[PDB]
């Protein structure tokens, strides 16, 4: 069921959530990444999210706890319903077009440090008209063909 390739992609996320890297994920660290994802969860909401895999009585999300969680949540290529939700994250201008500048802003905020050329490569990957901007149609385009 769980392949090595999937585990490697999950471990990357765990390393992003852990700010000090103590092995567990508190509500503070959990809400830091969720904030840059266009979401705004409260203290009470962040607590319930942790309880999903918390059954040892620690109130945090350890390494094996997150791995199991990301396995049942991250399904790689999601449906169109979730695709629209993530599309509005990279497009903070709400115009429907995601340029290089916009994309690089969200990437750096997420914690992924990249250069300008790296962003231009991701943009042209989903771009069908080669205009530097990626709309909703082009967003799904990269989910069906790289
Ligand atoms: Ca940590
Ligand atoms: Ca925009
Ligand atoms: Ca376009
Ligand atoms: Tb725990």
From Swiss-Prot:
The modification N6-acetyllysine is found at residues 19, 92. It comes from Homo sapiens. The keyword ATP-binding does not apply. The modification N6,N6,N6-trimethyllysine is found at residue 113. PANTHER family: CALMODULIN LIKE 3 (PTHR23048:SF0), MYOSIN LIGHT CHAIN 1, 3 (PTHR23048). Keywords: Acetylation, Calcium, Cell projection, Cilium, Cytoplasm, Cytoskeleton, Disease variant, Flagellum, Host-virus interaction, Isopeptide bond, Long QT syndrome, Metal-binding, Methylation, Phosphoprotein, Repeat, Ubl conjugation. There is a cross-link at residue 19 (Glycyl lysine isopeptide (Lys-Gly) (interchain with G-Cter in ubiquitin)). Homotetramer. Interacts with MYO1C, MYO5A and RRAD. Interacts with MYO10. Interacts with CEP97, CCP110, TTN/titin and SRY. Interacts with USP6; the interaction is calcium dependent. Interacts with CDK5RAP2. Interacts with SCN5A. Interacts with RYR1. Interacts with FCHO1. Interacts with MIP in a 1:2 stoichiometry; the interaction with the cytoplasmic domains from two MIP subunits promotes MIP water channel closure. Interacts with ORAI1; this may play a role in the regulation of ORAI1-mediated calcium transport. Interacts with IQCF1. Interacts with SYT7. This is Calmodulin-1. It is linked to Ventricular tachycardia, catecholaminergic polymorphic, 4: An arrhythmogenic disorder characterized by stress-induced, bidirectional ventricular tachycardia that may degenerate into cardiac arrest and cause sudden death. Patients present with recurrent syncope, seizures, or sudden death after physical activity or emotional stress. CPVT4 inheritance is autosomal dominant. Ca(2+) 1 binds at residues 18, 20, 22, 24, 29. Its main location: cytoplasm. Ca(2+) 4 binds at residues 127, 129, 131, 133, 138.
